[PDB]
Design a protein around this nucleic acid. Structure first.
Lengths: 240, 159, 156, 235
RNA sequence: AUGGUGAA
RNA sequence: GUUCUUUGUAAAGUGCCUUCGAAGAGUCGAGUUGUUUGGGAAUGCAGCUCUAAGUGGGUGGUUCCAUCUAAAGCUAA
RNA sequence: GUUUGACCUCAAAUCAGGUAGGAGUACCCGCUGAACUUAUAUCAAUAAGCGGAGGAAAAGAAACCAACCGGGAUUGCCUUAGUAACGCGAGUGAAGCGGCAAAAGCUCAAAUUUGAAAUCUGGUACCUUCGGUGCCCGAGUUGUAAUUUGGAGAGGG
């Protein structure tokens, strides 16, 4: 294959070491917090940061009430190879592919994982309209061996797949996902999470400039705190 | 064949050294016409309704660079290897060596012009650099010296 | 004839420069030409000649949105020009049609096997039990593309 | 007649640009020499030449390594307008109303089309906004007369000034985009129909004494975003 | 001599 | 004359004190072959082998001194 | 990257903005140029021919003239003078100084603006149009903007 230079190897090694140190510190702090040995730590209460357009920063604590969250892959940092600790979490959510997104239920046990995978993904709480549009625009149903991933097309297919829990149409799945329904976990796993199209999706004179501008804006909009008690960063997913 | 003074060029820096030098130079791109014009208009608008430090930029003018050399003010000098009037640049390497100013020969005058918002720049030199890049400037100077004076110590010999 | 050059003159580095040329104050002082240009721009702005960049931004923000804010009215009669014929109405493609329109499997097989763009119908009417059971239609894109092609590829 | 290659050479324009101009002007073929000669005077050709010059200049600037210059060039650039091309093709408003059938069909089809690489999400959002405006105007005027749910979709017929224009809307289910269709050709029609529908909607709102473009209900836009979320005010 | 014209 | 504008830490001139302080090369010149003058030091112009220095070089008379700074250009009477 | 873009070069456009042809020719500025006519000299650096502008043209402010108590752009007249000088026969033939007419000196190259290519051609919208401003593009850094030509000149107090 193509020759590999030393600069890239050194940069990747340093970035991976930094990421591993951050992950180890965050995991150790979270484990101690769960043990209730909060006598000597930087902070005990959880924090969630909301950033929106000019930019305004809002810091709010996290409560035990369940909430709906949407997570989209970001493919970052640039020179950071995904570590095993983050690799397992990504594989569990099958979000390895870029631009992929899925819906998860916000719980106390999920907050440490969200913090661990915070730099790699962008999270937020979408509105009902956004969820409905996303579900009705894209979808996948695995059909019979079953090597086919044909897009969702018929309501009767929904009846055939689940059937038992009254899920007979796409609107039933939309309600179960948006609302804290019993079948929220079951439907989400079978939903074959969406593969959102990339932003620029182009290359050329104008496309290169647009991509450069988008990358420049991404750095300002998204940041990697790298702190042990780094609050979870939330953006307006409805815009996407 | 060609005399020793000719063929002294074309013994440019290696890929890594040239890339590092251009990366360092790209941090001191002189403001283009539009940038300077907008800055001046903003200053005028501020003055209309009611102390910056010395600006840092790469000195590139052939006459300006030659004036900077022979006074020991310049620290690094980049020399194009494709100057059609070769006589304009034949004396630059020897003059720099006599003055002791570190110098290097880079491939293409258009490459020098690109980093100075010009179609073609005969030479590109640095006089003053920010304290942050002072260590980087010294490291680049040492690397250029090692890769040019010692590696190509025979550049001034063997016709 | 061919011998290496000798550094008799370049062997010793020049410790001292060539000419003193005492430095002018402008080198240690902010540029005066820039100040002159700034004063000229200030004079132009005062004389109502140059719009400040903030004023230009404010004016342009109001502008660029006044489009489609004027009535345009308030053509094929030429012998060598013909109007574009519109498509005919529907051909009984109801989601819940009478059982007669439900083509038999033998004729449905012939419809499927036949070539494309030379077919009586682009669809197979079906008897769906409920409205909610109506599926999607991914062939609408192809039909619209064909219509667009025919619009500009019609030798009238 | 003059061959297509001959006409392109006479116009010395790119094949894609020539097709765009032909679609905008409605030329059909092997084309008449007089029609092609007349088409050469359209300002759209000058706009395309300016676009090509800007593209080459921007490529030069980006290759040189000056992002600021490219950004400034892009900011100063302006897109061409189809406002005057509409009038010549449709001298009278009734002609535009009659021809609005294909425009509405294409706009409604593209509104439900998912975002892809070929078409940016901005175009889809604009088409959805145009469709919402049209639906709100139709509902306010109560011009819907015929409904026919079919495999293709629901065939609507709005009696705009008694012209009973028939339009089709596909279902909301996801659509698998085929590779056979070339979106480049469809994009020109999309833009032309978007401009035509913008002008027609403004004219209709002015006739009905309604302010255009109306805003959208934000609280509804977070729940039932669509036709209902687009509030309209008479004055 | 200089500058041109014609021509079994 | 009448006026409307002036503009800005903007420009110019003189004396004093300090530090610097850059001048035209296939060019002069020699050689050689033709032309020019009534010109004895063919100066001047024309082909070509050759081709220099910057307290230097050219033009002259006396063992030194006198004048100028060529190889770039404009200017009404 | 088996790939894109730049620098440089070479060509096309019935593209936009520009100019040379020729005539006239007494005077001017260069090339070229004979014989009659008289004992290399002489008609003669003339006649004719060729090329280039004007109302005048060239030249013009010393690498000058002078050996004096020194003069101080070029130009034309008188004078120097029918002298010096040449040919030593025939003949050819100047110039300094002196008086008069008129008098204006300047523009580049050469040493860094580098604390800011600050210069300018062209397109466009306006106005107070032999032009001015804003914007845009290009020329330029292989040098356009300030000052200086020894009579000096430049950076500072």
């Amino acid at each position: 294959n193509k020759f590999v230079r030393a600069e890239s190897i050194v940069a990747k090694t340093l970035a991976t070491s930094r990421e591993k140190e951050r992950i180890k510190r965050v995991s150790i702090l979270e484990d101690k917090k769960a043990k209730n040995e909060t006598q000597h730590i930087a902070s005990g209460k959880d924090f969630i940061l909301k950033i929106t357009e000019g930019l305004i920063r809002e810091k709010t604590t996290y409560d035990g009430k369940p909430a709906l969250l949407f997570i989209v892959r970001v493919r970052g940092p640039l020179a950071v190879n995904i570590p095993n600790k983050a690799f397992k979490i990504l594989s569990l959510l099958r979000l390895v592919e870029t631009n992929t997104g899925v819906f998860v239920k916000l719980t106390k046990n999920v907050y440490p994982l969200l913090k661990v995978i915070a730099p790699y993904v962008v999270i937020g709480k979408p509105s009902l309209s956004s969820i409905r549009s996303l579900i009705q625009k894209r979808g996948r149903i695995i059909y019979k061996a079953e090597p086919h991933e044909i897009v969702l097309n018929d309501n009767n297919i929904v009846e055939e797949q689940l059937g038992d829990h009254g899920i007979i149409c796409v609107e039933d799945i939309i309600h179960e996902i948006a609302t804290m329904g019993e079948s929220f976990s079951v439907c989400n796993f079978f939903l074959q999470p969406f593969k959102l199209n990339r932003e620029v999706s182009g290359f050329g004179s104008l496309n290169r400039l647009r991509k450069i501008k988008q990358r420049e804006a991404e750095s300002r909009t998204r940041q990697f705190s790298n702190a042990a008690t780094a609050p979870v960063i939330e953006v307006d997913i409805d815009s996407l | 064949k060609v005399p020793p003074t000719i063929a002294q060029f074309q013994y440019t820096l290696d890929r890594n050294t040239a890339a590092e030098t251009f990366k360092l130079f790209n941090k001191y791109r002189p403001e283009t016409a539009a940038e300077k014009k907008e800055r001046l208009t903003k200053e005028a608008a501020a003055v209309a309704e009611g102390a910056s430090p010395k600006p840092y930029a790469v000195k590139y003018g052939l006459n300006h660079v030659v004036a900077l050399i022979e006074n020991k003010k310049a620290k690094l000098v980049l020399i194009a290897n494709d100057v059609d009037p070769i006589e304009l640049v034949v004396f630059l390497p020897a003059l720099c060596k006599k003055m002791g100013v570190p110098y290097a020969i880079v491939k293409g005058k258009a490459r020098l012009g690109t980093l100075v918002n010009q179609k073609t720049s005969a030479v590109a030199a640095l006089t003053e650099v920010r304290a942050e890049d002072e260590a980087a400037l010294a490291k680049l100077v040492s690397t250029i010296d090692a890769n040019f004076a010692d590696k190509y110590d025979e550049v001034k010999k063997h016709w | 004839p061919y011998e290496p050059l000798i550094d008799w003159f370049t062997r010793h580095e020049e410790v001292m420069p060539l000419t003193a040329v005492p430095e002018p104050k402008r080198r240690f002082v902010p540029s005066k030409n820039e100040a002159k240009r700034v004063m000229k721009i200030v004079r132009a702005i005062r004389e109502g000649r140059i719009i400040p960049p903030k004023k230009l931004k404010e004016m342009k923000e109001k502008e660029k949105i006044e489009n489609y804010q004027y009535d345009l009215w308030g053509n094929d009669h030429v012998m060598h020009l013909r109007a574009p014929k519109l498509p005919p109405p529907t051909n009984e493609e109801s989601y819940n049609p009478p059982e007669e329109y439900l083509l038999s499997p033998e004729e449905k097989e012939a419809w499927e096997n036949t070539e494309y763009s030379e077919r009586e119908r682009n669809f197979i009417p079906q008897k769906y039990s409920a409205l909610r059971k109506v599926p999607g239609y991914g062939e609408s894109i192809r039909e619209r593309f064909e219509r667009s092609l025919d619009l500009y590829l019609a030798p009238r | 007649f003059i061959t297509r290659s001959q006409a392109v050479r006479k116009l010395q324009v790119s094949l894609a640009d020539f097709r765009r101009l032909c679609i905008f002007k409605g030329i059909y073929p092997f084309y008449y020499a007089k029609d092609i000669q007349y088409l050469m005077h359209e300002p759209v050709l000058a706009k395309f030449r300016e676009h090509k010059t800007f593209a080459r200049k921007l490529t030069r600037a980006l290759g040189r390594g000056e992002v600021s210059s490219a950004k400034r060039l892009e900011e100063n650039r302006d897109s061409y307008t189809l406002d005057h091309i509409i009038k010549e093709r449709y001298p009278s408003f009734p002609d535009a109303i009659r021809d609005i059938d294909d425009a509405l069909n294409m706009l409604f089809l593209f509104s439900n089309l998912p975002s892809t690489n070929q078409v940016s999400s901005k175009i889809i959002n604009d088409a959805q906004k145009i469709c919402n405006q049209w639906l709100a105007y139709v509902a306010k005027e109560r011009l819907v007369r015929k409904v026919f749910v079919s495999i293709k979709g629901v065939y609507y017929q709005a009696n705009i000034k008694g012209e009973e224009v028939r339009w089709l809307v596909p279902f909301k289910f996801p659509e698998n985009i085929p590779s056979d269709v070339d979106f480049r050709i469809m994009l020109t029609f999309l833009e032309f129909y978007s401009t035509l529908l913008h002008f027609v909607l403004y004219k209709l709102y002015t006739d009905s004494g309604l302010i255009y473009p109306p805003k959208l209900d934000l609280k509804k836009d977070k729940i039932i975003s669509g036709l209902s979320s687009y509030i309209l005010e008479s004055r």
